[PDB]
Design a protein around this ligand. Structure first.
Ligand SMILES: OCCCNc1cc(N2CCc3ccccc3CC2)nc(-c2ccccn2)n1
Ligand SMILES: [Fe+2]
Ligand SMILES: [Zn+2]
Length: 443
């Protein structure tokens, strides 16, 4: 169909007025738009993209760590097996480390070498992609992070309307910025964002990137291709065959992101990306306060448990922080959060009563304010409020956390464990009771 290659939802910005215009964030967060490309964003805001140029990064922090992914230079939009006889989904990539200075040399010499070649089915060249460069330290990247505060509020790393701001602690690469340094053919394999949170990506240039996007409600189709072809959807590297997708009637959005264009990946959108030239990119996540974002984040949280995959966003901890500190005026969002909190509260009361009925002591432990969420040291599930810690770890004050299930499996009557309580039931009951719909006259 004509419907399988739809146009890209695109906003064309000329000036600051266009950037701060409220219908912009409404357009981005609209679930009908799986991706929005905000063209001319850097130029409209007079953002200095030079602060993220390779030359400036080397000057700034030359020994800064870079995760290198070594990949094959594949033709156009295809992915061929090593031999060059068939198109396959699987893509191979080894990981190593280098520094900004060393990767910069490679990026620069790669460009010089292509100029020289320009003046002179397999097999494929090997290229290196500089990935996951951690721009979290404000003392190392002061000017860079300050430049990003010039964005409109809805797209910033930190803002009142961002769920990831309400988490109350750092989640690396989600509420901190990551940088990517690229050469032609540097590929980002197919994926969804952590816990289906929206992402913001700005191309620093000077080259272009080519994006491929499938709406969230088709992710189950791609999951099936992965299972059929012996791939883990969440954990393997794969590059979809567009003819497979065409055949299965999956619509594919496809577009070029030029320097200074911002790409908004909406909640749960499946996407993959390749550099067309030499460029850098910066990216982070944002969680808009919408029913759709919250719903998709909870669904993925629950799906991750089934797949034994850690959720980077602690949705229980987050949901309590929303109830404590956010006046929520959307009826559909409010009812989702309320329902979730009730589930948490009931499950916690059931467990706590079973412990007390078995004669197991619950130790008041409290909590430092701003203390991060805890995860089970064995299975990596989020553990809320009741923490299971071995007698020895308790004595040593290391407080290594287990979930109830993992503690039970280790020690059948919990004889090896103490149960630590970080919040009184009465306090949580009140936060729940005092969490009510705020009236708003807007839509
Ligand atoms: O525009 C730049 C950013 C493109 N987006 C990327 C790149 C990337 N890199 C690491 C993954 C990887 C593995 C193997 C080969 C290549 C890559 C891509 C880099 N990882 C992610 C990511 C990871 C976890 C959750 C959400 N997103 N997003
Ligand atoms: Fe990503
Ligand atoms: Zn566990």
């Amino acid at each position: 169909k004509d419907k399988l290659n739809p146009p890209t939802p695109s906003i064309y910005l000329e000036n600051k007025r266009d950037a701060f215009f409220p219908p912009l964030h409404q357009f981005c967060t609209n679930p009908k738009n799986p991706v929005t490309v905000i063209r001319g964003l850097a130029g409209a805001l007079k953002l200095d993209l030079g602060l993220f140029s390779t030359k400036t990064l080397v000057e700034a922090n030359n020994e800064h760590m870079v995760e290198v992914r070594t990949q094959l230079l594949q033709p156009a939009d295809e992915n061929w097996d090593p031999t060059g006889t068939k198109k396959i989904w699987r893509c191979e990539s080894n990981r190593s480390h280098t520094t900004i200075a060393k990767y910069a040399q490679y990026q620069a010499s790669s460009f010089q070498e292509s100029l020289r070649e320009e003046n002179e089915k397999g097999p494929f060249k090997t290229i290196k992609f500089g990935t996951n460069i951690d721009l979290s330290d404000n003392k190392k990247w002061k000017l860079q992070l300050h430049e990003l505060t010039k964005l409109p509020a809805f797209a910033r790393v930190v803002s009142a309307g961002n769920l990831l701001t309400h988490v109350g602690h750092t989640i690396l690469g989600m509420n901190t910025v990551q940088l990517y340094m690229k050469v032609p053919g540097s590929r980002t394999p197919g994926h969804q964002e952590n816990n289906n949170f929206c992402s913001v990506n700005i191309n620093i240039g000077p080259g272009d990137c080519e994006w491929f996007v499938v709406p969230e409600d088709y992710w189950g189709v791609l999951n099936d291709f992965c299972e059929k072809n012996n791939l883990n959807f969440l954990m393997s590297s794969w590059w979809p065959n567009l003819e497979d997708l065409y055949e299965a009637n999956v619509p594919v959005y496809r577009f070029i992101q030029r320097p200074g264009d911002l790409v908004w990946i909406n909640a749960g959108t499946v996407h993959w990306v390749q550099a067309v030239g030499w460029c850098n990119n910066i990216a982070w996540n944002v969680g808009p306060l919408t029913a759709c974002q919250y719903k998709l984040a909870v669904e993925r949280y629950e799906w991750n448990k089934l797949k034994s995959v850690k959720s980077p966003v602690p949705m229980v901890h987050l949901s309590w922080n929303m109830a404590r500190n956010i006046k929520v005026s959307d009826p559909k969002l409010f009812e989702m959060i309320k329902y979730c909190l009730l589930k948490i509260l009931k499950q916690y009361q059931t467990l706590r009563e079973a412990l007390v009925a078995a004669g197991k002591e619950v130790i008041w432990h409290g909590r430092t304010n701003d203390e991060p969420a805890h995860y089970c040291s064995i299975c990596e599930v989020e553990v809320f409020n009741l923490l299971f810690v071995t007698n020895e770890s308790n004595t040593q004050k290391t407080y290594i956390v287990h979930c109830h299930d993992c503690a039970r499996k280790t020690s059948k009557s919990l004889e090896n464990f103490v149960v630590l309580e970080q919040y009184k039931m009465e306090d949580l009951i009140q936060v729940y009771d005092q969490f009510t719909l705020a009236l708003s006259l807007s839509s």
